[PDB]
Amino acid sequence: MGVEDEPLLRENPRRFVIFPIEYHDIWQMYKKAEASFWTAEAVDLSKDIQHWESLKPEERYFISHVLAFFAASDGIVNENLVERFSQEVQITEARCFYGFQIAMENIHSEMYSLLIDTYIKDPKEREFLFNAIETMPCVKKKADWALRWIGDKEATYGERVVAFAAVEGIFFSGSFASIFWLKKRGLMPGLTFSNELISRDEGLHCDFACLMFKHLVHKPSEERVREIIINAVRIEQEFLTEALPVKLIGMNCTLMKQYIEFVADRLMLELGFSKVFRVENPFDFM
Amino acid sequence: MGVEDEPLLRENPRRFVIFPIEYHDIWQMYKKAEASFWTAEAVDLSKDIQHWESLKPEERYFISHVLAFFAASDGIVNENLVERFSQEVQITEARCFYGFQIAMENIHSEMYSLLIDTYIKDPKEREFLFNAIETMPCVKKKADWALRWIGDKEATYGERVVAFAAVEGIFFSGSFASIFWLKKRGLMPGLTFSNELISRDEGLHCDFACLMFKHLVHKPSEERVREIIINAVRIEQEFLTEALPVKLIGMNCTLMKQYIEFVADRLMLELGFSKVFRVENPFDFM
Ligand SMILES: [Fe+3]
Ligand SMILES: [Fe+3]
Numbered sequence: 273m274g275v276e277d278e279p280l281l282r283e284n285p286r287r288f289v290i291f292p293i294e295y296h297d298i299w300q301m302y303k304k305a306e307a308s309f310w311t312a313e314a315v316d317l318s319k320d321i322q323h324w325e326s327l328k329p330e331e332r333y334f335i336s337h338v339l340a341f342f343a344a345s346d347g348i349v350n351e352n353l354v355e356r357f358s359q360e361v362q363i364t365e366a367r368c369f370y371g372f373q374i375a376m377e378n379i380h381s382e383m384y385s386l387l388i389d390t391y392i393k394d395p396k397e398r399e400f401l402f403n404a405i406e407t408m409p410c411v412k413k414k415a416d417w418a419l420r421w422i423g424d425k426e427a428t429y430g431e432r433v434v435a436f437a438a439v440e441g442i443f444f445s446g447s448f449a450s451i452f453w454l455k456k457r458g459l460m461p462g463l464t465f466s467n468e469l470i471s472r473d474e475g476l477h478c479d480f481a482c483l484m485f486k487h488l489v490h491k492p493s494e495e496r497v498r499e500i501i502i503n504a505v506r507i508e509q510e511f512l513t514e515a516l517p518v519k520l521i522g523m524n525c526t527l528m529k530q531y532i533e534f535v536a537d538r539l540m541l542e543l544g545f546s547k548v549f550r551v552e553n554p555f556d557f558m
Numbered sequence: 559m560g561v562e563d564e565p566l567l568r569e570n571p572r573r574f575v576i577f578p579i580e581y582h583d584i585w586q587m588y589k590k591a592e593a594s595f596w597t598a599e600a601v602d603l604s605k606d607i608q609h610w611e612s613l614k615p616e617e618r619y620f621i622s623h624v625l626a627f628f629a630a631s632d633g634i635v636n637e638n639l640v641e642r643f644s645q646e647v648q649i650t651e652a653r654c655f656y657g658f659q660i661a662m663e664n665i666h667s668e669m670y671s672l673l674i675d676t677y678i679k680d681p682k683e684r685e686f687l688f689n690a691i692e693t694m695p696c697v698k699k700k701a702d703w704a705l706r707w708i709g710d711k712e713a714t715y716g717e718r719v720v721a722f723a724a725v726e727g728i729f730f731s732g733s734f735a736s737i738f739w740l741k742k743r744g745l746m747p748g749l750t751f752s753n754e755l756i757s758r759d760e761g762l763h764c765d766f767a768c769l770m771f772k773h774l775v776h777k778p779s780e781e782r783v784r785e786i787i788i789n790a791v792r793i794e795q796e797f798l799t800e801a802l803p804v805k806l807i808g809m810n811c812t813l814m815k816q817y818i819e820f821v822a823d824r825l826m827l828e829l830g831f832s833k834v835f836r837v838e839n840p841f842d843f844m
């Protein structure tokens with residue numbers, strides 16, 4: 273109390289001793305992660321270029337900007353895992369998971385940067401896109417919001433796992449949808465297949481956050497969680513309708529605002545709470 | 559001065575941005591780590607038990623004790639990477655490597671534990687072996703030595719990479735030789751195969767240490783490195799001849815003493831220094 277009453281956060285003199293397994297649910301999340309390991313090199317990019325050149329200039333803009341956003345955010349997710357989550361959490365099973373997630377975030381980042389390098393030959397444009405945190409106004413709101421939660425010294429782990437479930441779950445959901453939309457139009461198999469791997473990986477990272485949440489003894493209030501989730505939805509929605517609008521690739525903005533609300537509902541439920549928006553999923557392809 | 563003079567350790571505002579790669583040498587080692595990924599499940603242990611049962615009782619004692627030593631040490635290595643190296647090193651390329659070494663250490667720990675669970679069914683004997691740091695005097699020296707370098711708030715990164723290259727290079731070399739000895743005797747393909755994978759990985763983790771060392775501007779002196787490596791050789795030698803004698807599996811304690819000295823000379827050469835012992839490699843199987 274406040275931390276020593278938490279099985280997840282209290283001193284474990286066996287934290288670096290692997291066996292035996294005590295938390296089987298947490299352990300299996302780690303085994304699932306491990307069993308789905310992939311490298312960036314596995315993704316065949318060799319047919320993507322022709323599709324990319326056939327695209328309209330504004331689509332190539334949207335897509336390059338989504339890639340840059342993803343690449344930048346992974347780094348923020350990674351910072352939090354490395355500096356906080358993997359430090360403060362004391363159960364071995366959770367540490368293995370987080371250890372592996374860090375590895376995977378690096379492969380996610382590499383993939384996004386391979387996609388960028390493959391499509392965009394201009395090194396000035398590459399640099400612009402890689403430095404997206406400094407160079408892209410559209411990512412600011414999202415990058416700032418996530419970095420806040422790293423630097424926040426008061427906030428409990430419970431509130432902070434929520435925020436990063438919001439990052440990997442809500443902040444990514446519009447862009448994931450976007451690439452799945454492109455699959456619907458038979459465009460860029462390399463991008464869209466890599467997109468399947470990464471969103472699966474990200475959904476798993478949210479599942480894990482939810483599982484960590486359940487094992488918390490002192491959870492934040494439904495009130496407080498709602499506060500964070502709604503806040504994250506609004507930002508995502510502003511990102512997708514204003515800062516980098518989805519019309520750029522032929523999508524309905526209104527329906528996207530709705531889907532972001534559906535994702536948040538699903539995450540709220542997964543966190544042991546009640547829906548907030550009570551809306552259906554408008555996308556049969558998600 | 560203090561440490562802002564070090565390319566490896568000075569502020570890197572781009573530390574979580576993957577691209578572009580600037581340290582190609584360091585990055586290719588990450589790619590090599592990543593290309594050699596494996597899981598414990600991949601190793602077939604089915605054919606091992608009949609050989610296990612054929613051994614003399616003091617051969618089983620020796621092996622299970624080498625296994626327990628390994629699972630213990632991995633956790634210390636792990637602690638160090640998690641709490642220290644991956645935190646303090648600022649170049650993106652190196653953080654990827656360490657990020658991945660952490661994941662591979664957890665797989666190594668699992669492997670060793672699986673070996674133990676497979677050969678040893680007695681629950682009490684399992685607990686005794688997993689708790690080897692508290693329960694096994696033979697590993698006290700090696701463990702305390704390593705742990706001292708995590709706690710040491712004054713030693714430089716330059717000294718501590720040497721220390722952990724000694725841990726993964728010298729503290730493991732005798733035990734690795736043991737298992738290759740069993741391979742020569744045609745015993746236990748599962749054990750000896752998993753031993754092939756792990757000694758390869760640890761060679762790499764040592765190679766990586768050497769590469770980091772080479773990139774430091776303020777290296778420790780040859781004298782100071784000698785002192786550390788020599789201290790390590792004596793502890794490993796005591797281990798293999800006094801505390802857990804390799805005699806117990808039919809090896810010569812005099813030739814093993816020598817092999818440790820040869821491993822250390824090789825490490826010293828790799829750190830950019832001169833030999834210490836000048837003895838040749840007595841085992842034709844390393
Ligand atoms: Fe993620
Ligand atoms: Fe290692």
Ligand SMILES: [Mg+2]
Pocket residue numbers: 286287288289290291363364
């Ligand atoms: Mg444990």
Ligand SMILES: [Mg+2]
Pocket residue numbers: 572573574575576577578650
């Ligand atoms: Mg960088």
